[PDB]
Amino acid sequence: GSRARVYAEVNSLRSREYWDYEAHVPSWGNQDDYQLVRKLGRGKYSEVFEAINITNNERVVVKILKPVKKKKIKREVKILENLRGGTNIIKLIDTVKDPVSKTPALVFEYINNTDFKQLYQILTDFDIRFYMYELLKALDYCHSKGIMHRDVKPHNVMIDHQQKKLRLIDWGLAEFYHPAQEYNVRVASRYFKGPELLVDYQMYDYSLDMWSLGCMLASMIFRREPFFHGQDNYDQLVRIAKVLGTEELYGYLKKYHIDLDPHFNDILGQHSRKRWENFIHSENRHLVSPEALDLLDKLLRYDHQQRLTAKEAMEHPYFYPVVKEQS
């Protein structure tokens, strides 16, 4: 018995065709217009190339989708089409197929990304506020469109640190939120999984992404990346509990009637909730204000309902310097 505090009924209030992705029929253009230039990465579901559209010389990124149920392809395509024009969401330029093999691929705008491992050690206080605000715009947008990203992490946040451009990428795990629906907890990267996933609570919502966002904020202001570095999914919860506290975890479980896998009994131990100021030291002190800590405390909460929404986070005083600059 849990529902999102925002955008709970937004899919219910739209035409079924909006969210019934299995019924979506994409228009597949011709991949022969694109010349692959360089491999940028590979995952379990895709490989990604920098490319050039030979008809107009536009530099793009082509994500060639590996064999999966056509259902997952339709889901990602329909989600991207629903997100068209959204602020700081990667722009889908076209949906194309190899005209012979019919292998599908997604064509995105190019971003000249700086890998987060370099970047996150040289950000200023203002830079962190700026990039977190930009990422929040993308999450508020997709949540408002009834979509949970479910894989927020640095590797899915492309940042051009020269042009100050940020895009949220890889919508292949994203889903439509419907109240009371049970979702697969095998989403997100280990380090960015919310406690709800780690305790097998399936009735989660957009607030999962706000946990992941909080993990990114913590890594930036404190310079510990990833912030919660579990060795496996069990140890991931232990790492969280050593900060947020074990009695506090048990109160969350009790509230939502969550059953705890008994393997945790041997590993959680007993831990008091820690003050966020404990993470400050000389190397990160210039990034950590009272506002940053207040915001972080309101994101990295066990209780998914009590976490700030993306909009509430955007409204927090931590971002006032950014809003003032963007006005």
Ligand X SMILES: OCCCn1nnc2c(Br)c(Br)c(Br)c(Br)c21
**Which residue ranges make up the site for ligand X (CB under 6 A)?**
40-41, 48, 61, 63, 90, 108, 110-111, 113, 155, 158, 169
Ligand-binding site membership of 41 (annotated): yes
Report whether 133 belongs to an annotated binding site.
no
Closest among 27, 68, 29, 30 to 46, alpha carbons compared? 68
* Contacts of 208 by beta carbon, 8 Å cutoff, 6+ apart: 148, 150, 187, 188, 194, 196, 197, 304
Q: Is 10 annotated as a binding residue?
A: no
| 37 contact, one of Cl ion, ligand X, Na ion, none, CB 5-8 Å limit per kind | none
CA separation for the pair 294, 34 (Å, rounded): 47
Judge whether 46 is annotated as a binding position. Answer: yes
From the candidates 20, 94, 125, 151, give the one annotated as an active-site residue.
Answer: 151
Among candidate residues 156, 154, 157, 168, the one with its CA nearest the CA of residue 117? 154
> Is 11 or 113 the residue whose CB approaches ligand X more closely?
113
Q: How far apart are CA 262 and CA 28, in angstroms?
A: 48
Least CB distance to ligand X at residue 165 (A):
10
The answer to whether the annotation marks 219 as part of a ligand binding site is no
Contact 109, 93 (CB under 8 A): yes
Is 151 assigned a catalytic role? Answer: yes
Minimum CB distance to ligand X smaller for 196 or for 225: 225
Tell me the closest approach of the beta carbon of residue 160 to ligand X, in angstroms.
Answer: 8
Closest separation in Å from C-beta 269 to ligand X: 34
Tokens of 95: 């949906």
Figure out which of the listed residues 183, 222, 252, 319 binds Cl ion, where binding follows CB under 5 A: 183
DSSP string across 183-194? --S--S-GGG--
| Residue 146 contacts residue 139 (beta carbons within 8 Å) | no
Name the minimum Å distance from CB 248 to Na ion: 17
Which C-beta is closer to ligand X: that of 77 or that of 198?
77
Catalytic residues: 151
**What residues form the annotated binding site for ATP?**
40-48, 63
